[PDB]
Design a protein around this motif. Structure first.
Motif, mmCIF file in Angstrom:
data_model
loop_
_atom_site.group_PDB
_atom_site.id
_atom_site.type_symbol
_atom_site.label_atom_id
_atom_site.label_comp_id
_atom_site.label_asym_id
_atom_site.label_seq_id
_atom_site.Cartn_x
_atom_site.Cartn_y
_atom_site.Cartn_z
ATOM 1 N N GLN A 1 15.016 6.215 14.972
ATOM 2 C CA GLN A 1 13.631 6.098 14.526
ATOM 3 C C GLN A 1 13.417 4.688 14.001
ATOM 4 O OE1 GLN A 1 14.008 10.515 12.608
ATOM 5 N NE2 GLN A 1 12.019 9.508 12.249
ATOM 6 N N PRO A 2 12.763 3.807 14.762
ATOM 7 C CA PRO A 2 12.740 2.385 14.398
ATOM 8 C C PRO A 2 11.841 2.042 13.225
ATOM 9 C CG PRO A 2 11.378 2.761 16.333
ATOM 10 C CD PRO A 2 12.051 4.075 16.028
ATOM 11 N N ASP A 3 10.972 2.946 12.792
ATOM 12 C CA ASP A 3 9.961 2.626 11.795
ATOM 13 C C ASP A 3 10.344 3.193 10.433
ATOM 14 O OD1 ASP A 3 8.245 1.112 13.465
ATOM 15 O OD2 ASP A 3 7.399 2.969 14.298
ATOM 16 N N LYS A 4 10.578 2.291 9.482
ATOM 17 C CA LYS A 4 10.714 2.691 8.089
ATOM 18 C C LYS A 4 9.485 3.458 7.615
ATOM 19 C CE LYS A 4 12.908 0.183 4.335
ATOM 20 N NZ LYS A 4 12.815 -1.011 3.454
ATOM 21 N N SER A 5 8.299 2.966 7.960
ATOM 22 C CA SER A 5 7.061 3.485 7.404
ATOM 23 C C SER A 5 5.953 3.374 8.435
ATOM 24 C CB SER A 5 6.665 2.720 6.138
ATOM 25 O OG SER A 5 6.012 1.504 6.474
ATOM 26 N N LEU B 1 1.572 3.711 8.282
ATOM 27 C CA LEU B 1 0.365 3.872 7.478
ATOM 28 C C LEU B 1 -0.789 4.274 8.377
ATOM 29 C CD1 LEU B 1 -0.928 3.865 4.707
ATOM 30 C CD2 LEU B 1 -1.200 1.386 4.871
ATOM 31 N N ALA C 1 -5.401 3.707 4.350
ATOM 32 C CA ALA C 1 -4.942 2.321 4.288
ATOM 33 C C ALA C 1 -5.943 1.433 3.559
ATOM 34 C CB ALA C 1 -4.700 1.781 5.698
ATOM 35 N N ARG D 1 15.311 -2.089 7.473
ATOM 36 C CA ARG D 1 15.117 -0.766 8.050
ATOM 37 C C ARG D 1 15.310 0.377 7.054
ATOM 38 N NH1 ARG D 1 13.972 3.314 8.702
ATOM 39 N NH2 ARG D 1 14.040 4.844 10.425
ATOM 40 N N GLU E 1 0.787 -1.227 0.000
ATOM 41 C CA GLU E 1 0.000 0.000 0.000
ATOM 42 C C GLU E 1 0.822 1.283 0.000
ATOM 43 O OE1 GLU E 1 -3.715 -0.416 2.407
ATOM 44 O OE2 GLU E 1 -2.493 -1.808 3.597
ATOM 45 N N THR F 1 8.075 12.520 4.718
ATOM 46 C CA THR F 1 9.117 11.902 5.522
ATOM 47 C C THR F 1 9.407 12.800 6.717
ATOM 48 O OG1 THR F 1 10.038 10.859 3.538
ATOM 49 C CG2 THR F 1 11.462 10.969 5.464
ATOM 50 N N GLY G 1 14.687 9.109 9.696
ATOM 51 C CA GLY G 1 13.451 9.535 9.068
ATOM 52 C C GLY G 1 12.411 8.425 9.028
ATOM 53 N N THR G 2 11.138 8.830 8.982
ATOM 54 C CA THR G 2 10.006 7.914 8.867
ATOM 55 C C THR G 2 9.021 8.459 7.843
ATOM 56 O OG1 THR G 2 10.192 7.103 11.144
ATOM 57 C CG2 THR G 2 8.064 6.828 10.062
ATOM 58 N N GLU G 3 8.690 7.653 6.836
ATOM 59 C CA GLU G 3 7.713 8.074 5.837
ATOM 60 C C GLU G 3 6.293 7.792 6.322
ATOM 61 O OE1 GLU G 3 11.071 6.306 2.930
ATOM 62 O OE2 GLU G 3 8.984 5.697 2.607
ATOM 63 N N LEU G 4 5.430 8.787 6.159
ATOM 64 C CA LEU G 4 4.044 8.748 6.599
ATOM 65 C C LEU G 4 3.136 8.715 5.375
ATOM 66 C CD1 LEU G 4 1.708 9.147 8.630
ATOM 67 C CD2 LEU G 4 2.410 11.503 8.926
ATOM 68 N N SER G 5 2.338 7.647 5.260
ATOM 69 C CA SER G 5 1.404 7.441 4.155
ATOM 70 C C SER G 5 -0.015 7.413 4.709
ATOM 71 C CB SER G 5 1.692 6.127 3.405
ATOM 72 O OG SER G 5 2.801 6.248 2.534
#
Lengths: 214, 217, 116
Positions: C8-12, C14, C116, B102, B56, C88, C109-113
């Protein structure tokens, strides 16, 4: 976006020497810089991630360093399989993910003068309305060479194309072809076709020519 | 081990469509982000698109935005790239790449598949001799392999019996949209009466084979 | 004491439109002393999303209590997420400096989408 610039485009080193490749970022990427290796004809493969971490199965002579906007990939002793293209890639600023332009590591050797030959268009080709004149430069080093076409002393711009082979597997030299393409009409308006070659290995520029019709 | 096999590339005309596939094996396909990376002939690596493991989260490069659609099918362990309204600038080798858990760097790569966007039509090559000059030392002779599409052509000399001293140059794309190429060889000038020299040209995309004898005068 | 790291542990992440997005960030030390700030984007055109020091940020709530002397959690929550919030997000440690605080280290960085 963030722009990565690798300088120089071509790095010339002898086997067993140290290679030091640079990658400069237009703005800081901290430690989030990877290095990829591309041997001729193969897919890229990861060498270094996180600016300094060696990927699994990558030989020890590869090492990465730097941070912020200045990075360095070092090869302690160049082996034969190390003459390839190397790209850096940043993943701090995304999207988009951006790559450097690539640095190619070429084998250094002593200067080699080209052997120069010229070939008139064959009668079979003239029978089809076109004329190709080929100038061959054989087994020279280094790559830089000036090839100049003159037809009845007029210098020819925009109607020739050069093609260069990769470094020979045996003697690490280059070979080059320059092809002058004319219409059959234009080719018969002139008599003297000459290819003049200037190269570092020549004590004087070498010219090969022919008179149309032998 | 980890394997990524690509397919679907070929020659298409401007404005037409293609579909690339990247079949994966040796890892859990569903939990990795996948990317498409391309390399135009003679140029560097360029990022095209990425799709999250769940399918997604999707980003595109600006130059393909609105024409390419990336997707995946975890049931078949294949990644797809749907390329529509292709342009000449889309000509490239396309690689599929698996990301690190990661970070957005590429741990493994496919072998690549080639996309050629061109208006030219399939054409076999004309083969002309580059006759050795009558002037003995060493002599050069060759074959000019002109006006064919698409790539590649193969050249051998004397049916592979002549390999030493042969240089077959990379093909050059002329303004007509067709390719041209020379293949030359260095031989002893003493042997220009003894041995005969034949270049064998194979252009599979047009079912062309030419065996052109090259001789003095 | 190892050098300060911003993690920042989260790649992404949603998030559905209208829900609340959580952006995780951890600092592995409190030396040097200085504030944490959140940005969307990198470079000079960075949008300030949150600043521990000063300022009003009505959409943003910190997960932890930052006034704790021992605090190392700098995760934030962004409410009423719309598609305009995609991007991001960077968690950045500053150090006090002379006149003003200066960037010290940044997370990956963390990308926010959205939706869902």
């Amino acid at each position: 976006e963030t722009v990565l610039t690798q300088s120089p485009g071509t790095l010339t080193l002898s086997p067993g020497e140290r290679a030091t490749l640079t990658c400069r970022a237009s703005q800081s990427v901290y430690t989030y810089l990877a290095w990829y290796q591309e041997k001729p004809g193969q897919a890229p493969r990861l060498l270094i991630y996180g600016a300094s971490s060696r990927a699994t199965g990558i030989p020890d002579r590869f090492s990465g360093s730097g941070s912020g906007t200045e990075f360095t990939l070092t090869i302690s002793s160049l082996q034969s399989e190390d003459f390839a293209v190397y790209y850096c890639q940043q993943y701090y600023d995304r999207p988009p993910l951006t790559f450097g332009g690539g640095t190619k590591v070429e084998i250094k050797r002593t200067v080699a003068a080209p052997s120069v030959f010229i070939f008139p268009p064959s009668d079979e080709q003239l029978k089809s309305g076109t004329a190709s004149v080929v100038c061959l430069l054989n087994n020279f080093y280094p790559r830089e060479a000036k090839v100049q076409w003159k037809v009845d002393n007029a210098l020819q711009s925009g109607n020739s194309q050069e093609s260069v082979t990769e470094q020979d597997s045996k003697d690490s030299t280059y070979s080059l072809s320059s092809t002058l393409t004319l219409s059959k009409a234009d080719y018969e308006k002139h008599k003297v076709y000459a290819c003049e070659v200037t190269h570092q290995g020549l004590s004087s520029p070498v010219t090969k020519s022919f008179n149309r019709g032998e | 081990d980890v394997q990524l096999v690509e397919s679907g590339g070929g020659v298409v005309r401007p404005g037409e469509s293609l579909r690339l596939s990247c079949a994966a094996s040796g890892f859990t396909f569903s939990s990795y982000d996948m990317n498409w990376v391309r390399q135009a002939p003679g140029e560097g690596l360029e990022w095209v698109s990425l799709i999250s493991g769940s399918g997604e989260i999707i980003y595109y490069a600006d130059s393909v935005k609105g024409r390419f659609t990336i997707s995946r099918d975890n049931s078949k362990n294949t990644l797809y790239l749907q390329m529509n309204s292709l342009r000449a600038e889309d000509t490239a080798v396309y690689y599929c790449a698996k990301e690190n858990n990661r970070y957005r760097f590429f741990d493994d790569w496919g072998q690549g598949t080639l996309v050629t966007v061109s208006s030219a039509s399939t054409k076999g090559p004309s083969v002309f001799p580059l006759a050795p000059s009558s002037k003995g030392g060493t002599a050069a002779l060759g074959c000019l392999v002109k006006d064919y599409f698409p790539e590649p052509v193969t050249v051998s000399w004397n049916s592979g019996a002549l390999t030493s001293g042969v240089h077959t140059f990379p093909a050059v794309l002329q303004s007509s949209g067709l390719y041209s190429l020379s293949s030359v060889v260095t031989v002893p000038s003493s042997s220009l009466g003894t041995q005969t020299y034949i270049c064998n040209v194979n252009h599979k995309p047009s079912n062309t084979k030419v065996d052109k004898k090259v001789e003095p005068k | 004491e190892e050098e300060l790291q911003v993690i920042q542990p989260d790649k992404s992440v949603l998030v559905a439109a209208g829900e609340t997005a959580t952006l995780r960030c951890t600092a592995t030390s409190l030396i040097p002393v200085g504030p944490i700030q959140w940005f969307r984007g990198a470079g000079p055109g960075r949008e300030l999303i949150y600043n521990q020091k000063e300022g009003h940020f009505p959409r943003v709530t910190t997960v932890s209590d930052l006034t704790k002397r021992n605090n190392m959690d700098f995760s934030i929550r962004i409410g009423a997420i719309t598609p305009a919030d995609a991007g991001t997000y960077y968690c950045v440690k500053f150090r006090k400096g002379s006149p003003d605080d200066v960037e010290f280290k940044s997370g990956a960085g963390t990308e926010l989408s959205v939706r869902a």
